[PDB]
Design a protein around this ligand. Structure first.
Ligand SMILES: [Mg+2]
Lengths: 219, 200
DNA sequence: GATCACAGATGCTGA
DNA sequence: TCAGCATCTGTGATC
């Protein structure tokens, strides 16, 4: 339903991912690819889409590490839309028979925290899926769809949001609202019980908690 | 014991037999659309990889996607086989793009399985499956929050709070003040203040 | 036609 | 994706 094509295709790569064949492929499809340290995940696609890239075997490996679902729930807490892209065959040779595990995980990542899975065949596939997501999610809409003014994509904003999210009571939406209000973390970290409760979604109780955290001296 | 309703016309599929033999109660119903009804909320659509592709290029896939999405809260399309069948090497851009569009514009969820075994494993999983961290002492929330800054460990978070005794105090300290803390140099300090001070 | 208090709907966080 | 519950809101009783 969203109609209009958006701006210059742009995404941020986390540094740990920078190494991939993926970024060069991405640039080769005309996507601007900016390598930065992101709080989480490997590709920042739009303000509310994070992408975590995993080879089918790292998918497997981290399922049994315990790594997978910790990472999973973090991503799902902080971004409104999480894509895990699995690159290569869903079940690698080395992992046959353990398939009941793998597919079960997939079904759980999907139902438990609403994460979204794409399976790609190679880097180029991942690079295509990322590029399409980038394009699709930009796009401002047509019939009866308001267009809002949208914050420019940045890593610095992402961390500003990651830092706000770490507070009790402060989640995805509120962190955003806190930024539009105060314009700055430091202006926010400086306001009063009163002013922090002005925010849609925060009450006296959560405001008190926040203030008390900001101010209580450390023994 | 998970129940799943299988549509009559899916019943030629190899999948349901495997389902049966994993303890899933396979019941045939006459489905309004879809291949397996996993709950009232959750419908599954099973397509072979080159069926997915064939129907991408017919324009049936997106028509089907439409009805699935309108008539059910959650929609899965399980695509059995490699995402890009040989017949379609060279149109992959078109395939993945459709996968992107299915998820962002229709909200539809995809799985990719390697064969009927996987598809049945996935279905069974869903059938069953729908059947810090921090806790409030202020001192601890403090060490948590600081530790979500780039580069900052627990030991550095400690030392930060030793020097400045308060977050509010740290959050307003000078680049020079901050970068002197042990385990925060110029590099990490620059980022911190950039984070602290960059406007919307 | 305005306030208000409060009970229950909304919409969030946190996973 | 969704439980659990904080925050918000619509309602209707009163002035
Ligand atoms: Mg990764």
């Amino acid at each position: 339903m969203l109609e209009d094509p958006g701006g210059r295709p742009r995404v941020y790569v986390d540094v740990r991912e920078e190494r991939s064949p993926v970024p060069s492929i991405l640039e080769s499809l005309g996507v601007q690819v900016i390598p930065k340290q992101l709080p989480m995940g490997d590709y920042l696609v739009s303000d509310s889409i994070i992408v975590e890239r995993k080879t089918s075997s790292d998918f497997a490996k981290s399922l049994f590490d315990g790594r997978l679902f910790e990472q999973a729930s973090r991503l799902a807490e902080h971004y409104e839309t999480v894509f895990i892209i699995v690159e290569g065959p869903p079940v690698p040779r080395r992992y046959r028979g353990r398939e009941r595990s793998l597919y079960a995980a997939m079904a759980a990542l999907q139902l438990d925290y609403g994460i979204r899975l794409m399976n790609t065949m190679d880097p180029k596939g991942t690079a295509l899926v990322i590029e399409s997501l980038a394009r699709l999610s930009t796009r401002e809409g047509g019939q009866r769809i308001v267009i809002h003014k949208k914050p420019r994509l940045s890593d610095v904003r992402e961390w500003q949001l990651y830092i706000l999210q770490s507070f009790p009571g402060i989640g995805r939406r509120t962190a955003e609202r806190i930024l539009e209000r105060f314009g700055s973390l430091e202006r926010f970290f400086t306001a009063s019980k009163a002013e922090i409760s002005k925010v849609e979604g925060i009450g006296e109780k959560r405001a008190e908690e926040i203030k008390k955290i900001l101010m209580t001296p450390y023994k």
